[PDB]
Structure 1
Amino acid sequence: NQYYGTGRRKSSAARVFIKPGNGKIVINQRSLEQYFGRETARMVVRQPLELVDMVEKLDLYITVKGGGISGQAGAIRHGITRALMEYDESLRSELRKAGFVTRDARQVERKKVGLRKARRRPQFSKR
């Protein structure tokens, strides 16, 4: 009866499984307060389940690989939105407005030849 969604971010990849329950969040066999030492990521993983009022409504089992703290939090949000649209599908009209169902495609830019970074050019001098 578990409902699944994949969320992706910069280079992260979340695997979200939704079961109806009381609101127990388990990420890589760890609690959310244990896993993300960051309140902004604790907000963004709870943002759609407070967009709708379903924090206490459903439990969830989460695995996530690759990336960093905000990357994994973004993919967790995008997986949760993918699975809540699998749960109901009447919520896509709201989560689209919330900008959540859109996968953020902002990858890092490659270092280019001549340039010290993606866009930073070296220091110029006429003389």
Structure 2
Amino acid sequence: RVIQTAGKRKTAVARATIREGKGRVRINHKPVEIIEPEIARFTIMEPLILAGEEIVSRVDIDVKVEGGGFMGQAEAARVAIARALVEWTNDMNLKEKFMKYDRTMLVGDSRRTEPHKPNRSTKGPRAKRQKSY
């Protein structure tokens, strides 16, 4: 059988597909063990290291991510992978462990950018040219 799940971050959207296999994880056709940099590789692999080999050595996950920078893509993939593993296992111990470690694995992040305003519109909404006469 097959299961599909999704994950979202700021302007990034990931969709993961899980089935039974040997333990292969691929993001945009390339393995996860050689993803760069380290600070994104670890972000993506935390859920697998949490679950363990006795769960990941029986599944094959493929993720397709689009939009919104490499850190955001990594976080979206992490969320999607966690949700897919939980829906595939139907176990509550794993879900509780995830909620304790970080509740944003399963729950999403609800933070976007604030529109900019007209004093120095280029810089931000709360930033403006100085006055030092």
TM range (shorter): 0.7 to 0.9
SS in 2 for 1:78: helix
> What is the percentage of aligned positions where both structures have the same residue?
34
Kindly tell me the number of residue pairs found equivalent between the two proteins.
125
Distance in 1 of aligned mates of 2:58 and 2:96: 20
Q: Report the TM-score, using the length of structure 2 for normalisation.
A: 0.81
The structure with the greater share of residues assigned to helix is 2
Residues 1-127 of structure 1 mapped to structure 2, 5 A cutoff? 1-32=1-32, 36-53=35-52, 54-87=55-88, 88-90=90-92, 91-99=94-102, 100-115=105-120, 116-125=123-132, 127=133
Q: Relative contact order: is structure 1 or structure 2 higher (C-alpha 8 Å, sep ≥ 6)? A: 1
Unmatched segments (≥5 aa) in structure 2: none
Distance in structure 2 (CA, Å) of the matches to 1:65 and 1:4: 16
Structure 1: distance between partners of 2:113 and 2:77? 19
1:44 offset after TM fit, Å?
Answer: 1.2
Taking a change above 3 Å as real, the CA distance of residues 55 and 46 of structure 1, as seen in their structure-2 partners, is farther
Deviation, 1:76, is 0.2
Quick one: distance in 2 between partners of 1:31 and 1:118?
Answer: 40
Give a deviation string over 1:57-91, Cα, whole Å, max 9, x none: 42111111111110100000110111122112412
Q: Residues of 1 paired with 2:125 and 2:91: CA distance? A: 40
> TM-score when scaled to structure 1?
0.85
Name the CA distance, whole Å, in 1 between partners of 2:19 and 2:40. Answer: 22
Mark the runs of 5 or more structure 1 residues left unpaired by the alignment.
none
